[PDB]
Amino acid sequence: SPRAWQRMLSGRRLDLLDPSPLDVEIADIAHGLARVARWNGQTRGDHAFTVAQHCLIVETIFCRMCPGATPDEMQMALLHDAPEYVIGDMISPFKSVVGGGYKTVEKRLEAAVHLRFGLPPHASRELKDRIKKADTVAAFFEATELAGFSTAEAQKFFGLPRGITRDMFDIIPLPSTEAQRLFIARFEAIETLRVT
């Protein structure tokens, strides 16, 4: 039989094509994101550079680029790649190749994750733009520091960062256990700011 859901280590499961927010838990997300690699694993270092670590850098960069950000926006930045815990990581060039299809699932997973945590199902276009810019800045530094791209390649593909420098975050690839711990800790810190 074709598989319709992803079982989680915690016992929960999420329907792949019509995910329910009520099946989403941050422990499940953090576990997976701390083991899923960016850049197809083509990165310098004994440990893969994980999606969880990418999320941490993105949220950090987002806050530096957007000093007026609200806690809800910070959480949307941290959780932007959360759907990868069920759909996996695919490099951007293939996102333009996949069917519609895959993109529909990705959008549904975003809504499920957001709704779970009392966030708008989708970021506004303006907020999406801010988070995407932070993502692309992170990509520039990962591409050059970790994934073997020249500065010329990274500038072409990602653009030259505007006012963000590599000393504003930590890019050395973390082991899964540490990435997981740090991801949950930041999520919990932002949750605390949100009620406030």
Add this chain to the structure above:
Amino acid sequence: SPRAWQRMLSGRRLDLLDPSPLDVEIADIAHGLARVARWNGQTRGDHAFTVAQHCLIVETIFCRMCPGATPDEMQMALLHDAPEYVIGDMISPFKSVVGGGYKTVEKRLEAAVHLRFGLPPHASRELKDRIKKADTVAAFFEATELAGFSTAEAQKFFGLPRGITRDMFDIIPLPSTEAQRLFIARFEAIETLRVTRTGG
């Protein structure tokens, strides 16, 4: 500008949509496969369960299921998931959602990898079937031991293995550096067998 290639740590690059066999090198494959996770990282263990480790289990299971396998066939088993070093890992359920363009890329990458190593560009229909059966048995064991699936779930999705047992291979997730070392070692061992079988 959109990106048309993947640069490797070794300096070479592979074109994503029209890969050349001559840009493929096993060191690049091993490095990446030893860091790409299966099961979307939803696995028990301090370390991700990597595609490289999956390949090693598949090739071992394949040999056990197919005692008459030739060295070329062993190598095609080990390398079946090699394209993931450029296309990444996607769970099987999303293959019916992803579209024909993706499948075409996969197949072109299989050819590039195979041609690099002097193998048929694609496995015969019959070899493909044998490798797939081995892959599915590996999936059964990974699903139950690592990825949180019950025996009933794994039986439903992958079938109950027949004559393959968990003691035949190593399922606990290995760190990237060790999965990489073991993957290269097995690739090289099979390469030696290929030279033996082909003769002068």
